[PDB]
Amino acid sequence: WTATSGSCKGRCFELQEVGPPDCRCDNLCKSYSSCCHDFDELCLKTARGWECTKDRCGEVRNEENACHCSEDCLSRGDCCTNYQVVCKGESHWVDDDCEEIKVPECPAGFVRPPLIIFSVDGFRASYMKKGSKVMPNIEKLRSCGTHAPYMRPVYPTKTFPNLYTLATGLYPESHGIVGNSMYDPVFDASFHLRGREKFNHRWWGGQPLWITATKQGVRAGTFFWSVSIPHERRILTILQWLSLPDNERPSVYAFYSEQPDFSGHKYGPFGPEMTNPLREIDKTVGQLMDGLKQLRLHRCVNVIFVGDHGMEDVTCDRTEFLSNYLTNVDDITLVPGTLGRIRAKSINNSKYDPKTIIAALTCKKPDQHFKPYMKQHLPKRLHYANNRRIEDIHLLVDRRWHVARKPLDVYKKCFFQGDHGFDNKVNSMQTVFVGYGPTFKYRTKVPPFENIELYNVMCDLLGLKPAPNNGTHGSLNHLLRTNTFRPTMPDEVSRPNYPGIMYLQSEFDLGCTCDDKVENKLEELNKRLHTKGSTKERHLLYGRPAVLYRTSYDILYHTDFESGYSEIFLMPLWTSYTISKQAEVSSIPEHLTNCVRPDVRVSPGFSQNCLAYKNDKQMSYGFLFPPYLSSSPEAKYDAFLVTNMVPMYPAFKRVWAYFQRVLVKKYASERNGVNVISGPIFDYNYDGLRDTEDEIKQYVEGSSIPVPTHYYSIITSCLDFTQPADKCDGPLSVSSFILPHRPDNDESCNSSEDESKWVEELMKMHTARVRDIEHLTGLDFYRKTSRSYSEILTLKTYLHTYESE
Ligand SMILES: *[C@@H]1O[C@H](CO)[C@@H](O[C@@H]2O[C@H](CO)[C@@H](O[C@@H]3O[C@H](CO[C@H]4O[C@H](CO)[C@@H](O)[C@H](O[C@H]5O[C@H](CO)[C@@H](O)[C@H](O)[C@@H]5O[C@H]5O[C@H](CO)[C@@H](O)[C@H](O)[C@@H]5O)[C@@H]4O)[C@@H](O)[C@H](O[C@H]4O[C@H](CO)[C@@H](O)[C@H](O)[C@@H]4O[C@H]4O[C@H](CO)[C@@H](O)[C@H](O)[C@@H]4O)[C@@H]3O)[C@H](O)[C@H]2NC(C)=O)[C@H](O)[C@H]1NC(C)=O
Ligand SMILES: CC(=O)N1CCC(c2ccc3ncc(CC(=O)N(C)Cc4ccc(Cl)c(Cl)c4)c(=O)n3c2)CC1
Ligand SMILES: [Ca+2]
Ligand SMILES: [Ca+2]
Ligand code: NA
Ligand code: NA
Ligand SMILES: [Zn+2]
């Protein structure tokens, strides 16, 4: 109940929401149907429209008008945004030449440059070039400020998960807004686009920027807006708030536009009907900039122009139906459209079986336009699993398609021509970022980056300490003129042991065999030097990785590779090796096919054993440094050390062997050498973070050898590929992957074919940032380079996406 007979006189767009049952006058009151009776009359004035005309100039103030053109309007802070242009001979902001903003040029009483975040829904990245001729204000922001060619949203590429990511710096799995529609089984409650459950604070986790600011003494309301408040009134409200007294005035503001998304759904991303909404959003930007220019704030405020996701062509005819795959379609609940989430319709049905659902949805139709996954098997770069609101069964839908349960869902709901929500690496899903103001750089293009990084930058713009989040603070320092954050590298927690030769061959009883008994003081000293680290500068190019947790591990040197060998997990945490452009690929010699060799630097008690693999009929093994890339027949023996062995399902060995035998050399050829760091990952609780020992769910049968859930590789070379990877003077280039260690290749529908037709496609899907591997391993890479730390943080956040232009 709301006692709506209170009044909004003197309270229009008040910043502090008043508590029930008292009636409200803030920018969200309409959403709750709780505005005071006179909110429309007092707060949503529309008389005479939004623009001054010549006849209105110097008018007698009429308090009924939407905005004013009377002489007093500047001091009242309520002129129409074009007042100075029409009445005082001034230019529109868009018509002024851009001039570098070297320092904030702020009115007296401004303690810091305010931040205005201008969020556009469904603003696809390519609109910035394709729509440029119809968006002059946005084009000026872009060209004069700092811009990226595109910004990567989070998955799913839907509004609420992305806007809340922008506000918190958190993945959806961590902030809790994992879709536009959700069921929380603990709450037993549902969150929907339409309705009010979504207003309950229990859905919304993390700490959004307005709370971070308020806690630290910086005034900031929430960034939401009731949909019925017209954009011109939103802009005038922002400008009026900026005219508040110093002690009352916020330092951060948010404008939101539902366009161009609303039209994009109706017309497609590039429908001819899309030009008008782009023109209209541009005109709103120009109202804001003219309004700031009026207030003498146009060289004081930092403005961020940012989107939540892009927009793809999607029509009703491109729908896959689960009723064409499943017997039991009535026993499931599906969250449908551009992604699928499946759970049981009833928790009382004990005949519901996820295994049978997945199998019925796997590679059943030749051109099948979705792929089922158990959530832990989704690409780790999506960071979409560690939340109870994310159903165990997920469907990754191909761009341009939908999934639905039954055909009647689609015609008892063709209307629409656009949609979004797909994998966040998809080109059509990318969105925009421009920063303009004194704290951003001038006429600067930055590489594409992820929206999870922006919360830290907004905190830097405002002088705030960010709450713990998923950005990498410092990775976007290159966007900023000043206010950079100067991080220090984390401290190494565990220092390595450097074992020498400490065991005789006969101390080992590992059940391993090797034909290595086939027997010079020239090369004997040489092999000793290799074991003490003489080739280490070739194979460890960027320093040893730091271990950021407490553990026991050994550094092991070899002619062709270096590794950090865990005494606890019985295998390397990392193995590092460089392959030059001139490297030759060789075979595993016949006599060495089943060779495994005890490592006399590491105790039998801290070694794997071959008997465990013989007995585990499901599990085989591979090697981290590939024997195929040995520098000489003699060095090849090191590759068969038991300390280089890792457990691998036979189905995974098909993937791994092709990567090692074919793809590393291909990359070295293309990139002018590569440095490779490879290793295991254990993430049985799918939280994106390194497992401790007591979280491991699977071991090689009868042993303490833990089975990785994934294998990673980080592949580094010189950005200037005229220089070899091992003699690079400047910036680096990286690509990485986190491959799921699965006992089948059911994910790859073409896996019966030669590896040349499916393995690289799998790897591309499981592309990763170095930072993702850092979280999953507790290792810190690139500790010893010639590059600035912020540049290295940017490098660690890079994702190689394998998309076109
Ligand atoms: C992305 O960045 C984020 C932010 O840094 C990273 O997330 C952090 O990761 C930490 C480790 O997973 C985690 O720290 C834990 O916090 C527990 C206290 O949590 C509450 O308080 C914080 C701080 O205000 C708050 O943010 C939390 O918010 C979560 O939960 C609410 C509601 O439940 C949600 O609204 C909100 O969205 C958020 O949910 C997300 O996180 C939770 C986990 O906290 C997930 O379950 C959700 O699915 C969702 O992802 C909380 O309100 C604290 O209790 C933990 O300590 C336990 O674990 C340690 C191990 O070190 C152990 O030693 C302790 O004894 C203790 O164990 C006891 O409890 C166990 C569970 O019952 C039990 O099994 C034991 O036997 C013990 O009794 C721990 O310190 C931190 O909360 C999150 N923060 C956020 C916001 O998500 C994220 O890792 C980054 N991602 C990547 C990939 O890098
Ligand atoms: C967490 C919190 O403080 N809550 C209290 C307010 C509550 C809430 C009440 C009213 C409301 N009315 C309209 C919208 C639509 C909207 O504003 N948009 C689509 C833009 C937008 C802008 C910024 C962000 Cl971060 C997002 Cl996700 C969406 C909205 O979402 N509303 C929400 C939510 C919980
Ligand atoms: Ca949106
Ligand atoms: Ca984990
Ligand atoms: Na075996
Ligand atoms: Na297959
Ligand atoms: Zn939309």
From Swiss-Prot:
Record: active site: 159 (nucleophile)
Enzyme Commission numbers on file: 3.1.4.39, 3.1.4.4
Database matches in Gene3D superfamilies: 4.10.410.20, Alkaline Phosphatase, subunit A, Extracellular Endonuclease, subunit A
Pfam families: Endonuclease_NS, Phosphodiest, Somatomedin_B
SUPFAM superfamilies cross-referenced by the UniProt entry: Alkaline phosphatase-like, His-Me finger endonucleases, Somatomedin B domain
InterPro entries, A to Z: Alkaline_phosphatase_core_sf, DNA/RNA_non-sp_Endonuclease_sf, Endo_G_ENPP1-like_dom, ENPP1-3/EXOG-like_nuc-like, His-Me_finger_sf, Phosphodiest/P_Trfase, SMB_chordata, Somatomedin_B-like_dom_sf
Residues carrying a glycan: 3, 348, 360, 470, 750
Modes of activity regulation: Inhibited by vanadate. Inhibited by micromolar levels of bile salts, such as tauroursodeoxycholate. Not inhibited by taurodeoxycholate. Not inhibited by hydroxysterols, such as 7-hydroxycholesterol, testosterone, dexamethasone and prednisolone. Inhibited by EDTA and EGTA.
Sequence motif: Cell attachment site, positions: 76-78
Chain spans, region Phosphodiesterase: 94-447
Principal location listed in the UniProt entry: secreted
Spans annotated as Required for secretion: 773-794
Effect of residue 265 to Q: 20% of wild-type lysophospholipase D activity
Disulfide linkage: 8-25, 12-43, 23-36, 29-35, 52-69, 57-87, 67-80, 73-79, 98-144, 106-300, 316-414, 363-749, 512-610, 514-595, 718-728
Site, Essential for catalytic activity: residue positions: 796
Protein's UniProt name: Autotaxin
Origin species: Rattus norvegicus
